[model samples]
Target chain A: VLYVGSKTKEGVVHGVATVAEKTKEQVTNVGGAVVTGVTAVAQKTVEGAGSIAAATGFVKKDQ
Target chain B: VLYVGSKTKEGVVHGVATVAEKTKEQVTNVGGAVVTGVTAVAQKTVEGAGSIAAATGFVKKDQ
Candidate 1:
């Protein structure tokens, strides 16, 4: 049985996304590998969260 | 110009670590692909943050 609810998962993903976006902007001025690295991390983090959400049967209602 | 300071970087890393830890446990009970996926994401996220921190000259004082 899954211990987390759909709402909890959604909240977690939203929080991670918000932090990633803010960090991305902060590091943008740094540029170079850091920029590229953060971008990749942000994408992967979101993807991972999405996968977890889906696995827990919390598919997004819209596209 | 680096918009983020050492304290900010440390704070971000700490925040991510905390979330990752909590999420890891939540998914642990679920088990399987989700566990492995979240584990990898957490590791990568911490490493990415470390790299950015280093690039910004925020080397850890001790370690």
Candidate 2:
């Protein structure tokens, strides 16, 4: 009787753990791609800004 | 100059949209799994309680 209860609880915990494990991997992969893509875009913006500034003489180019 | 600015803004918007799409999927997946897991645990708890009650004759068998 007692063992049955223990086993039931263990099964519930194990089920939840399995869901969490799968969820973590999915979230991590999606999140990682977003970060990488955004960072690249942001880096490109700096170069874009530099080009504009240099063209307008707002920033002098390094000889 | 205007085109550069427009392109920059577009890039930012696109990046944000990508992030949002990724985030939505991840969040949906994780949230769905969590809800399912919780529901399963709750169901198990109810069954466990019922079994305990039945063993004590608190709940009569449907036989």
Candidate 3:
């Protein structure tokens, strides 16, 4: 969704864990919130990176 | 960052906008939250996807 930039594996694990932390604090539905949050964020992030790479000619246009 | 699977651009936009929508209701610090949230999620997702693809032999091992 937001094409910020590239990422490292550490970032992803931390972010998801943070999402879980937030869910624990505010939302009681940890399972639903955490799972969906992780999947959604990850999915969007990947798409954003791919889009950026494609735009910058780092990856193929057909991708 | 979650390595759920591959993604499409539409998913990214929708997910990020949803994140903003949540911020609008719950968190007042949209600037700090939304920005970091976006970057963190995108970064992790990219890493997750890369890891998964690399593991699955869909991407270059050297990646």
Candidate 4:
């Protein structure tokens, strides 16, 4: 439930969202912007990308 | 198991196979080639690809 993002001088724009209050606090404290209801989706998106990339390479012969 | 290959004018070259007889029927019903004893192999190949992809990303950092 952590909002993981890079720090930019303009502001902290997070790629993920902070789902829990504790995580929200931690993110805000760390200067990261916390978005709600999006952390899990973002995490899944990252993992899906990784899986598809690896799977495509693994199954190129089949294709 | 379904042979998921593209359709061609020469013939339908299915990648994944339909193992169930119903699937076999469906293929031939559509004027596609029905290569017996080969459907399961393509399904296994797809499953193997998925397993390898899962294992590669799921392995522990220590490994």
Candidate 5:
């Protein structure tokens, strides 16, 4: 699965989300198991606050 | 999906779990596809004891 990284305060990123969705959907399209969900733990620093200023979603596994 | 940030020594949080479960479950309730699982990389801290000390579950897509 695409483990997305998010900023605690930036609300949500699109790149991370997009990548996640793409990965999961691709798996599903390929007759694989779409990612059902994702879990992540990150360290937030004001410096790295916007590490994932991108998309959303989760990674899927090809069954 | 909710990216949970945990405090290594602060113990397990709750809000993140509740939210995560709710998000994913909501998708299922709406006849949408629910995420099956999640992967995460966490960095523990001693200061931000409970950023998302609540809820659980994953995000869904409009199938």
Candidate 6:
């Protein structure tokens, strides 16, 4: 162990706390992005289903 | 109320539908941002409370 003066000691602890938190937000955002990606895929599937429904001529007669 | 050629008529409707869905995505992102912002404020309040918690002479007195 090395002798860190009192001021440097304070900074080391405070910096660790800040870094810990900065990481949590980034991870939560990644989890969030995964949800958004899944949702986009679901919507794509549903949209394709609607297109198939239209092709059967059972949906509409419009141009 | 206008005579659009057949292909133009198809484009006109398809364009409206695409624009409609594009708008839904932007609005959803705005709502998403609001939740993230609220979550951020909550974390901020909690972190401030921790700082207040740690001020009780809990320093390690190294000999």
The prediction achieving the highest lDDT against the true structure is: 4
What's the lDDT of the predicted structure labeled candidate 6?
0.17
| Model 3, residue A49: C-alpha shift (Å) | 4.4
**lDDT string, candidate 5, A1-41, tens digits:** 44444433323212132123231122122222233444544
| Model 3: per-residue Cα lDDT over B1-63, one tens digit each | 544423323222122222322323232221111112333233334344432111010222242
lDDT of 2 by residue, B1-63 (tens): 122222112112121111122222342221111211112111122212211111010222342
Kindly state the fnat score of candidate 5: 0.12
Docking class of 4: incorrect
Q: Candidate 1: TM-score?
A: 0.16
Candidate 3: true interface contacts recovered: 0.06
TM-score of chain A of 5: 0.19
Question: How would the candidate models be sorted by DockQ, starting from the highest?
Answer: 5, 3, 1, 2, 6, 4
lDDT per residue as tens, model 3, A4-50:
43432322222222232232223222111111122333333443333
The CAPRI quality class of candidate 1 comes to incorrect
Q: Name the lDDT of candidate 1.
A: 0.23
Task: Give model 3's TM-score versus the native structure.
Answer: 0.15
Q: Give one digit per residue, the lDDT tens place, for model 1 in B1-63.
A: 333332211121212322222221121222112212221132223224222111221222442
- Chain B TM-score, model 1, reads 0.14
Superposed by TM-score, candidate 5 places the C-alpha of residue A8 at a distance from the truth, in angstroms, of: 16
TM agreement with the true structure for every prediction? 0.16, 0.12, 0.15, 0.11, 0.20, 0.10
Q: A1-63, model 1: which lDDT tens digit per residue?
A: 333333212122213332222221122221112212231122223233222122121222342
In candidate 4 the C-alpha lDDT for residue B9 amounts to 43
- The numbered model that scores best in DockQ is 5
By lDDT, the candidates rank as: 4, 5, 3, 1, 2, 6
Question: Which pairs clash in the backbone of model 3?
Answer: A1-B12, A12-B1, A12-B44
The residue-by-residue lDDT of candidate 2 on A1-63, one tens digit each, is: 122222111112111111111223233321111111111111112112211111010222344
For all the models shown, what interface RMSD does each have?
A: 22.4, 32.7, 19.3, 19.2, 16.8, 31.7
Q: Residue-wise lDDT of candidate 6 within B8-38, one digit each (tens)?
A: 1110111111111121222132111212110
Model 4 compared with the native: what TM-score? Answer: 0.11
Q: Score the docking of each candidate (DockQ).
A: 0.03, 0.02, 0.06, 0.01, 0.09, 0.01
Error of 4 at A28 (Å): 26
